[PDB]
């Protein structure tokens, strides 16, 4: 409250530890999926379900340009990119499986990181 503090975390390597997840994510052999923008010209249906669609490299311009306040709002697009992902495709489907892989291996990075 007022004038009544937690000890002060040193968050000052947070951005650059956010990117460097980002990157192992990027780089990851399931990320394929994730990289960029569905095309919503192309692909019916996914403009009119998701709702906020999220991706990779619009993480990464977000993350470049200071458009996350705190390490929680970047989780949070990760984590919508896989959320989008299971609303949109099949658990049985490669894409399914690749957002599956790819949750586990965000969160174990993050709570290696983080906590």
């Given at each position: ?14 951005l650059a530890l956010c990117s460097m997840i980002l990157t ?61 992902c299971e609303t949109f495709n099949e658990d049985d489907s ?22």
């Amino acid at each position: 409250s007022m004038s009544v503090k937690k000890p002060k975390r040193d968050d000052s390597k947070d951005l650059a530890l956010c990117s460097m997840i980002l990157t192992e994510m990027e780089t990851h052999e399931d990320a394929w999926p994730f990289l960029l923008p569905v095309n919503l010209k192309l692909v019916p249906g996914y403009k009119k379900v998701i709702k906020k669609p999220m991706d990779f490299s619009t993480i990464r311009e977000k993350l470049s340009s200071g458009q996350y306040p705190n390490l929680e709002t970047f989780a949070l697009d990760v984590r919508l990119v896989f959320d989008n992902c299971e609303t949109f495709n099949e658990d049985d489907s490669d894409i399914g499986r690749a957002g599956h892989n790819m949750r586990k291996y965000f969160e174990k990075k993050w709570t290696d990181t983080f906590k």
